[model samples]
Target: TSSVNELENWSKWMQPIPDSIPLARISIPGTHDSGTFKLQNPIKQVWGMTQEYDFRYQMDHGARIFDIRGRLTDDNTIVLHAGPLYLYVTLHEFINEAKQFLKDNPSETIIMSLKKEYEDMKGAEDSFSSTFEKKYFVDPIFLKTEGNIKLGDARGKIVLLKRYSGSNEPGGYNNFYWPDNETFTTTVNQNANVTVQDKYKVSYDEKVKSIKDTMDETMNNSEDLNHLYINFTSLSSGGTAWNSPYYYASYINPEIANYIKQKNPARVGWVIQDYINEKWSPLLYQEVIRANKSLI
Candidate 1:
């Protein structure tokens, strides 16, 4: 399930309570790393050349999103950590907008140009600062996840991970690189553990020969496939990592259920009060046709 689904499920458990039952202002540590990437500024050049003697890597640098929540904590004395619900809502908006833009402009060049513009307007630093205050300043709601989960917060620099979609795909012609999990975690928060996995299995002799063969054919019939890499990172220092299954059931499932309940309270049993307490387990198997419709 998508992240939105999980929030809907959470809403169902929130039903039953009257809207007047003051929603709790959930708080957690506000420092977490978050960011997104974009084409280099002065966007005319799609590619750049590196000097032979230069030590800098040729890959585009990942964009960074600094922790702006700290400012809220200091000013309001209320630490407003974004809950899964809030995070998904923001991402949902972004994805929908991006998807639409992609669909409207089928030209790859136009898409890339648009992406740069979007990133410039919605860069991590500026976007988070503006959105968080506008949406949840008065009564912010956060979810309960394990403590010690690494909330990306390292010296206000949150390296943007390469997005899972777009030109970054495995066979895309563009040269893109994502950070190693360890490096990413460290950049977001010092408590990250980076573990590199070996997907290729070959003897030392075979490995050497294989490398040579690939290099020899680099100029002719050049084709490459990107492999999927999965690395676990804690949500907090000691917190458990947000695994796929947990994310699916908790955040994704709840969002779907909640959206459904919003449309038809009698059918989903998700009234306003239920949203406050974060009770969503009971409505798991209930026919979600109504809820599902809200999702699509």
Candidate 2:
């Protein structure tokens, strides 16, 4: 009975899924390129590996490459484990085509000027390819001393395996284990006093003050301050819980939704949450996003 149930679940997993619901596309003429584009959700579970050649063959036959180029807005979400290779190839092709277009059209000011500034764009592309190969291929063998898996050759492209019952958290490897108790304690203690001082002096003084001022002004000027307060709280709490950077990005920034619209405009309504306060409410705590931007 258990085996039969397991087979039923496995059959469901293999079923051909229909395409996602279409999203509306939003475009802007000049300021920044915008539109709605379709993005497949990252494959969540890795099934057992087929032959590496088979996997490559499937991708070569089944996958259609696109020439994509656009900015990642403040709210852009990255799924590292999913095939970033596709996006990388897309960007590479777009840049190359743009360069070629400039070469063909010497009279075009934008292309001509860009060519002069980025004279080594082709060289940079070569370097990027070389670096990716070395990092993802060559380096692994030298780094791995154990009898465990060692990097083989150029053919040994890293592939994500579906998670089994025993699979650890994503990116969790043996050497990259969570910090030991003693190490964490020592590090935390060493930085404790400095962190407290910095938080009060920098974070509280700057960020908290700005938010408080904004809040106070909004409240003071409003005839229906009570109504506004209720409205604000309702919008803030409506979607997912206020945890993790992903949740914050989704609820807080229309810019991200704008980016989503560029690729998959029809899905924009589904891609983002709709709320009255989305337009007016400051979703990103200005200070936090700014701080993260600086770090990046």
Candidate 3:
């Protein structure tokens, strides 16, 4: 038997060939507000406070999905922003990184969930689609529609999961890319080939149980050919994670990671989190792969 060899990242980790599993069946990791990596004490930071590393770092490590939000402009421009504070990185920057990732790993795909965060921007929604065309790489490879993109269609490209598609867009693209399940606080959803869930709650105990339950499901219940399963492990403070998602994530994420290790699920889908480079990641991130005996 030919044993598997080590690879730099999970996107290229599969042996021999990449599996036919749909994008939904795979267990991927993601960042909630992926671009906010730097920490500054002067300004009010939410997205930046949530992220611990830059785009390249997370993409190289294991995170295959990126949740990004930004404000549109009058001059047909946009930049990654958290409130009035403009981030150093832009969508173009992340796309360049993603393009490099795809260039390096042809079998891999990146899900970049585009979000419209600034409500106060004047005439922003009017220019939404065109700005996207202008600012974003005009690639022919993007998965255009919602809910129908399979891993087969997504490989070697960046899939645009648009949350700002507006009421006129196809497949109700205006809705949150990952809308909540029955409950507003937590996240869970199931399609024919994949499932998505998040452990977000006010109390730590509640969040723990929710994640553990979902973990158990991932162990025994996920379908054999499931394309992908996304699990978000970040919690909010109050508009929320109001207390500081970093501290909250630091407080609960490692425990969830420890719990995941103890439970040892056979497969884990995209585990969305905050602060991926510090506290729980690489360790927690590694477990999401190591614990998955059936992944790839």
Candidate 4:
């Protein structure tokens, strides 16, 4: 049973799972635009914000994966950005939060999907990849071991899912071809394949279908460990107050939650969603975590 006590310690939920299991086979909860919770002002909040809480809150609630988009600032630090607006949250801040979470719950691993959200600031001396590798990726908290990583190798570390190229270091999941605004498949390495459903700017029905379709594929192939499935349940429209990512998430979260309940699939893949809070009645994250019961 997915007991209530387990949800109380969701941050360490992975403690009971076998360490030898590859990360790809585990059903993990993730947040899209994870660092945007600090956004204020009505317009920016509606358009840019995806999370209502900070990273610590998110991690404590069972989210193990993060969509971290950042820009190299003039100060030579990486700050989170969405489009032209700065999220005001630095990449270092996110790293700190993840480090603390991993420290507190050593049994858990965080999959950080790092993407270059904007161009480097004018005063930056190095390229995005070089700066990140030199400053951030050098940290020992990051799991630098490459190829298909297992839970044993990733525990108490942040698994870097590289979205930026020009990586000059050996590390986590390698970068792959991700086409804009559509579901696509690509090979990450010789040992791993990836399927991503990221049709972000689409009609409501279309986005729902895309998520469900990709998730269905993942559920059917749950036994295949080498194939990584990243299903983004986040969607955006034209950035209007009526059709922002938050608006879409309000409906999509519960809909998908109920859908998962009805189907009760074995694996839900790495479900990256928007507005990950307790407001969703059945709690979307819990259902995703519950689907992993068969693994135990």
Candidate 5:
């Protein structure tokens, strides 16, 4: 017999871990283009859809990080966007969902990576960064502390991975020079070094290689608490129906899941993926979660 309840309580999985562990050492599951779940039309869905479920579902399934892309609307509010198209989700909606999830599971923290996906629309009262800092980051839920954030200090707060410029407040991971669609190394929060594998529009074979390479680096240096590794198992090419992100993910999800299942690496970095659901059989997120056994 097995304790199925442990698997069921994935929402609060962090509660059992030693709080002194730096977040860089924890194997975290995250979603790429995390707000694109609302695209329903076949054409838009093919090109845009990344996540198939809502934010709460993702949280309950053990996703600790969110990739939030926003556009400043004419109404002076921020809405989720995928390039030029609106995804029918709003910044406030995601924030509320995160707030509720953290309320229900106070032992967990949410890392929100916010980026401006498009230029601001007309009639905005202020710049994107200004509006965001004044209206949103000012909330107490956002962690104001910075540099090498540990799990103990971050619990019950939202850690900001600021991808946009002009931040008035300092907290979470600060913005750095992210070259487009390449696996690169940089620094964040002034002290922490970061490695990212985000070749979004690359050939299928190359994308897989980049993900594996970054993952290998993370595994080899699992104890390096000063470095953060972010591996994106997401790829996008041409916009044809067959070459959509969903199509690529259909194959890549199982590929990475099986890889981790075989290797059982002690650390998997922060795996940001696409189409994160049970359809992949041996789920990638579950494997990522299981890697934390080494931590305890």
Candidate 6:
């Protein structure tokens, strides 16, 4: 039996599972606006930035799913944005980090929820399909649109959860996690094997409450226990949440972490959040591992 510690790398323990477990059935931790650690600011921006650490650090802390939004820059670099104002790293920068992480770990998997943000499109004409395969992602492991995908299948690769409706590769194995032309809501899912809900942007109290509510609802009442659940804890200021630093952090991060602390393994699902801080992030990862400890 391995000990649960805020000090250990949890992503390392999630393997050697029974061949029966599919990747989607696993509980994973993810970051929202994964590349926005350096984002400037938004109108009501309270959560200082969407993230505090880079992709490499997040991966080291056990974040597998990455919610990155891209914009074509005048220089043709595919940079990530937190809003119309803040620009973070480039798509290639993220990919470069991911590739290095995989080379070092060799047994982990990454999920990239790629999307397009509204930005100034001066000389940004290259599409995701063209840029994705040409330099960084060539033959990445993608989720099948149908059937159960086993965990053994996705080791050491980037699982693309594409939401950018722009013209891209013609034939690919990945499926879009969010619905086409829909970015603000997941009000119409049946808790499918792959489900993404967008219900952030409420009051801080409500934002935290919603995650608790969603976690409670799914942990106890989901039809398929193995369904991939993305329980979001991060929100943009554009909606309703105050644009304050860690607007939901005083309780929200700890709330979900504590909630997972009490639940069965694999119950809390993906607690997609902002600011993978050195502050509360270790226990967040610690609790994440606790909930998914049964896989070994």
Candidate 3 per-residue lDDT over residues 1-296, each given as its tens digit: 21234333465643222445555555667888787776575344643467867887887767878988877776556678765566777777888888888888776778887777775357555566667765463656555555545666677767765566543333212244455432222221234343456545547677666666666666675565534455677775443344567777776667767777776666766678877764454366767655434543
lDDT per residue as tens, model 4, 84-195: 7799899999999999999999989999999999889999888999999999999999999988899999999999999998998988999999999989998998969999
Root-mean-square deviation of candidate 4? 1.8
lDDT (Cα, tens digit) per residue for candidate 5, span 1-296: 22334443689888777789999888999999999998888878877889999999999999999999999988889999988889999999999999999999998999999999999998898999999999899999999999899999989999999999999888888889999999999888677899999899888999998889999999999899999999999887468767899889989988998889999898989999998888876888988888887877
The clash number for model 1 is: 39
lDDT of 3 at 232: 72
lDDT assessment of candidate 4: 0.90
State how far residue 122 of model 5 sits from its true place (Å).
Answer: 1.6
lDDT of 2 by residue, 1-296 (tens): 11222112211211121112100011000100001122233221111110112111212211111111222212221111111212222222333333343344321111000001011233233332233233322333112221111112111122111111222222211212222111111111111110010011122134233323333333343322111110011011112243322233244344432333233211111011112122323322121111111111
Ranking by lDDT: 5, 4, 3, 6, 1, 2
lDDT of each: 0.22, 0.20, 0.63, 0.90, 0.90, 0.62
Tell me the tens digit of each residue's lDDT in model 1 across 1-296: 22434323321222222222211110000111121112122221111100111001100111011121122222322121222111111332332333343243221000010111122222234333343334432111111221122222111111122222242111111213334322121221132221112112233334234322322232121121111112111121112223222222244235533443443421221111111112354342232322223222
Q: Estimate each model's TM-score.
A: 0.18, 0.18, 0.78, 0.97, 0.96, 0.79
Residue 234, model 6: Cα distance from true site in angstroms? 1.0
Q: Give the winner by TM-score: 1 or 6.
A: 6
Which portions of model 5 miss their true places by more than 4 Å? 1-8
Which stretches of model 2 miss by more than 4 angstroms?
Answer: 1-38, 42-89, 96-246, 254-296
Can you write out model 6's per-residue Cα lDDT over 143-229, one digit (the tens) per residue?
333244555555666667656555345322244446432223332224434455556556666766677776765576433644666
